Structure 1
Amino acid sequence: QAGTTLTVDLSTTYQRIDGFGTSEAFQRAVQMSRLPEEGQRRALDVLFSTTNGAGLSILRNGIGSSPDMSSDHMVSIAPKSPGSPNNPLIYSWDGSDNKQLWVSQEAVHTYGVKTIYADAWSAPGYMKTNGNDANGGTLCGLSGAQCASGDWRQAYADYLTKYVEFYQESNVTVTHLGFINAPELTTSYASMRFSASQAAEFIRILYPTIQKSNLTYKPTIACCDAEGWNSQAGMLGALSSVNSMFGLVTAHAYTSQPGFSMNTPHPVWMTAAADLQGAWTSAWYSYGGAGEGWTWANNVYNAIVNGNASAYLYWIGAQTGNTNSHMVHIDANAGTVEPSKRLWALGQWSRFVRPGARRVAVSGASGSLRTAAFRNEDGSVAVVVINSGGDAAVNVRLAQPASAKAWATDNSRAIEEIQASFADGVATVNVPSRSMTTVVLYPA
């Protein structure tokens, strides 16, 4: 044939895409802050730049639960107990939030990011059955968790609301708010155990607290950052009584993969995935291993197409260390920043599939090509082609554009523009070998 023709059907729609992003929690933002100004700027550019970076459109921040910044802990805005939940909470704002406020202010005001997801791993220790933000335990006052010290549920809702207000008064709007992380998992770090029933119980307290607050923008409540699709899907029954009081479902890709559509009315975000203990690799493709850029391009495809995800977040953007827990390597001694091809994989999506995009049908792929298509709010149509074979001539059309452009990521290209020859509404591209290519059709 005269290449492979991919035809986009704008009349067949699926989920909305809210975007793509990562976190700088657990003092990864502090590691970035220690770089020379040029290293700082390069780290921020590769994460958020829509011209020379991954164009990430969501930042996930931790709402620190710890009493201090020991180790990699995130200090809380209220690290000292008031003794009783009947006493006002004592807020001790540091103007920094574990250097996440600076990353957020750069994302929003330098790079145009509009989606800021703040998620607590735990309440402060004095609000919990175990008196500690680490080693699990549950919020005092929930069903099954009566504490000698009192019922701290309203206090935790006031606390989360105050955290959003500190960000607001620092000119950052938190758009989404989570109050647990991995509620099925006890860990040696910030962790807190809620059943799905307890999550619903708390949402019924947190929703009116937010709606009655003086916040300028009322953030959408999220739940529950379970460590896999399967674990989160098991919480949806109990959450269904409060579907009027939260608006985002969140889950990771650790204990199961995002390979089916959850039964919820809400958008579903895959909010953390990584090759956490794999030895550092920057490569796009070596053999299809767990850390390679190629693998992560495909992991995103699977989450969107098979998991019905509206967003995809790698665990950490930039940090130090020699595992694939993160996309961007910091060498603290050299003061340098090196993006892996996992950074470019997520950017090969995020640069072109912007917030509000609607996934749409595309036909004509077979064999070595996996394809998806997205209609942006500006009417630009982004067609993803993941090519596991040799160079593939592809034609991209609607079932009408005035111009086209194309970019590819592979072993020698980092979201590099390639030719998109444009004739009578049809873009013709050479999709490189073992690449992810995005072809964009633009209205006038």
Structure 2
Amino acid sequence: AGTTLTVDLSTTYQRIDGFGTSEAFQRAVQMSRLPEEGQRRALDVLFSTTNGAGLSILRNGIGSSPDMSSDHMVSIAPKSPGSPNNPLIYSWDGSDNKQLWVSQEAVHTYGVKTIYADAWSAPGYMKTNGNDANGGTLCGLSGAQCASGDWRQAYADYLTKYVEFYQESNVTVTHLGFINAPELTTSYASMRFSASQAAEFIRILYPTIQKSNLTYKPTIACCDAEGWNSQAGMLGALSSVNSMFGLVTAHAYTSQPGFSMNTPHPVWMTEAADLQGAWTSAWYSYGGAGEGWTWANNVYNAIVNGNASAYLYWIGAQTGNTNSHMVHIDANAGTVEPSKRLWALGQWSRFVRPGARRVAVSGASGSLRTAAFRNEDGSVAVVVINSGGDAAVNVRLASSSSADQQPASAKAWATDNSRAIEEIQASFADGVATVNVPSRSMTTVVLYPAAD
């Protein structure tokens, strides 16, 4: 009588903080160059819960560079004060590489409440190599002594000031990172920390945040390693400072998020993309690296197998013809073109809202991959990734709690080769939703308590 998926609300796993992306390295500046119509279409496809992906997290870069040449993110303190005991020279431009505008829109127009500010590097004058690019380490960490002096507290004060500048512009930074890919030396903003050096810095940053006049004390994150395997390798050294930070972060480049890390903290997958793959907007062709289907399955893997509480693609909107970004902007034409990778992330984010709890679901046939989430508002979202033909599915709840009320209505949306989070029939009868899950799709079925 169709396949029945039964949600067990009494078996719970990780909280979901949400889904998102970045506009770092002046990708936000590229959005700002669009006509007003195009700016709003780019902001809608990213953040709109009615006509967009409903992304619920924005990752901002804490600019390290002396200026905005090339795609560099200028620092709030680009000029050296000479000694780390001298006051830092802040030169706040009220733009932050156009990330403040994107943030203000995300928060005030679209209701986003999670903002993750992550430094790729300290300013060059705070580092062993005197540059924010080409690796090097923060002056004054163990094994990183500098003629210029110990810049560790100055770096903590600087990160705190950046958060303060966002606060005074009506945006709360909720999460704060001080490194990115700390195993990697690159030709752009980059900075090398060992796990011990990360733990040493957290000892200094934590009391700096805790003692500050910040209205909201942001959660310290570590360490945006390039994969699960590399980040897992840092957790031993980090365990001595588990009382001093509250978020573990890693990318999906050098390994996949396929296992639960041994950490007490929530874990986010903060960066993945097909960075160099030829642009495609396709949902499904053959399961290649850029296809919407592939990315819908990557998010599934990170949440169900990696115990991720969040999933961020690298870039939202950007110019150029690789899959590093979800949304193509043609600066000439003033056009915005979402790939089916944007719709893949949205097929999660629209229905699995911040503060959702992952809950057990059973009944899936071999062609179906399923997961279920109970939202803070009591709505229950059930993900079905269908690798087979169309599949008639029934969705129902069970609980061991008599406080859990039966749902009063259901709706369903699908993304596939012809649909972008398009509503499909959800035939509801006495607590059960019946849906025809399209061939080669990700479908989400949501059961709603009565608003009336």
| Short-chain TM bin | over 0.9
Deviations, residues 114-172 of structure 1 (Å, cap 9, x unaligned): 00000000000000000000000000000011100000000000000000000000000
**3-state secondary structure, aligned to 1:47:** helix
Shift of 1:180: 0.1
Does residue 253 of structure 1 match 2:252?
yes
Query: 1:408: which partner in 2?
Result: 414
Give structure 1 stretches of 5+ with no counterpart. Answer: none
Shift of 1:367: 1.2
Shift of 1:239: 0.4
Distance in 1 separating the partners of 2:358 and 2:232: 22
Deviations, residues 364-420 of structure 1 (Å, cap 9, x unaligned): 00210000000001110000000001000000001x110000000000100000110
**3-state secondary structure, aligned to 2:43:** helix
Map 1:145-224 → 2, pairs under 5 A = 145-224=144-223
**3-state secondary structure, aligned to 1:41:** helix
Deviations, residues 167-193 of structure 1 (Å, cap 9, x unaligned): 000000000000000000000000000
Shift of 1:23: 0.1
Distance in 2 separating the partners of 1:114 and 1:374: 19
Shift of 1:22: 0.1
**3-state secondary structure, aligned to 1:96:** coil
Deviations, residues 4-26 of structure 1 (Å, cap 9, x unaligned): 00000001100000000000000
Distance in 2 separating the partners of 1:125 and 1:427: 58
Query: 2:63: which partner in 1?
Result: 64
Say which of 414, 417, 428 aligns to 1:422.
Answer: 428
Deviations, residues 262-295 of structure 1 (Å, cap 9, x unaligned): 0000000000000001000000001111000000
Deviations, residues 52-98 of structure 1 (Å, cap 9, x unaligned): 00000000000000000111000000000000001000000111000
Query: How many residues get paired?
Result: 441
Distance in 2 separating the partners of 1:220 and 1:358: 20
Distance in 2 separating the partners of 1:263 and 1:376: 26
Map 1:12-411 → 2, pairs under 5 A = 12-398=11-397, 400-411=406-417
Deviations, residues 307-352 of structure 1 (Å, cap 9, x unaligned): 0000000000000000000000000010010000000000000000
The percentage of aligned residue pairs carrying the same residue is 100
Distance in 2 separating the partners of 1:429 and 1:331: 38
Distance in 1 separating the partners of 2:242 and 2:113: 24
Distance in 2 separating the partners of 1:388 and 1:145: 52
Distance in 1 separating the partners of 2:419 and 2:322: 23
Distance in 2 separating the partners of 1:353 and 1:240: 31
Give TM-score scaled by structure 2 length.
0.97
**3-state secondary structure, aligned to 1:294:** helix
Distance in 2 separating the partners of 1:6 and 1:239: 40
Distance in 1 separating the partners of 2:113 and 2:75: 24
**3-state secondary structure, aligned to 1:167:** helix
Shift of 1:233: 0.2
**3-state secondary structure, aligned to 2:336:** strand
Distance in 1 separating the partners of 2:214 and 2:307: 31
Distance in 2 separating the partners of 1:58 and 1:244: 24
Distance in 1 separating the partners of 2:355 and 2:257: 21
**3-state secondary structure, aligned to 2:189:** coil
**3-state secondary structure, aligned to 1:264:** coil
Distance in 2 separating the partners of 1:370 and 1:146: 52
Shift of 1:241: 0.5
**3-state secondary structure, aligned to 1:191:** coil
Distance in 2 separating the partners of 1:415 and 1:228: 29
Query: 2:444: which partner in 1?
Result: 438
Distance in 1 separating the partners of 2:156 and 2:199: 13
Shift of 1:442: 0.6
Query: 2:400: which partner in 1?
Result: none
Distance in 1 separating the partners of 2:353 and 2:448: 14
Query: 2:401: which partner in 1?
Result: none
**3-state secondary structure, aligned to 1:254:** coil
Cα RMSD (Å) of the superposition? 0.3
Give structure 2 stretches of 5+ with no counterpart. Answer: 398-405
Distance in 1 separating the partners of 2:185 and 2:422: 43
Shift of 1:43: 0.1
Distance in 1 separating the partners of 2:302 and 2:246: 19
**3-state secondary structure, aligned to 2:269:** strand
Distance in 2 separating the partners of 1:86 and 1:323: 45
**3-state secondary structure, aligned to 1:98:** coil
Distance in 2 separating the partners of 1:149 and 1:424: 72
**3-state secondary structure, aligned to 1:250:** strand
Distance in 1 separating the partners of 2:429 and 2:147: 74
Distance in 2 separating the partners of 1:85 and 1:290: 46
Distance in 2 separating the partners of 1:301 and 1:129: 41
Distance in 1 separating the partners of 2:129 and 2:369: 49
**3-state secondary structure, aligned to 2:191:** coil
- Structure 1 runs (4+) greater than 3 angstroms displaced: none
Distance in 2 separating the partners of 1:136 and 1:231: 17
**3-state secondary structure, aligned to 2:303:** helix
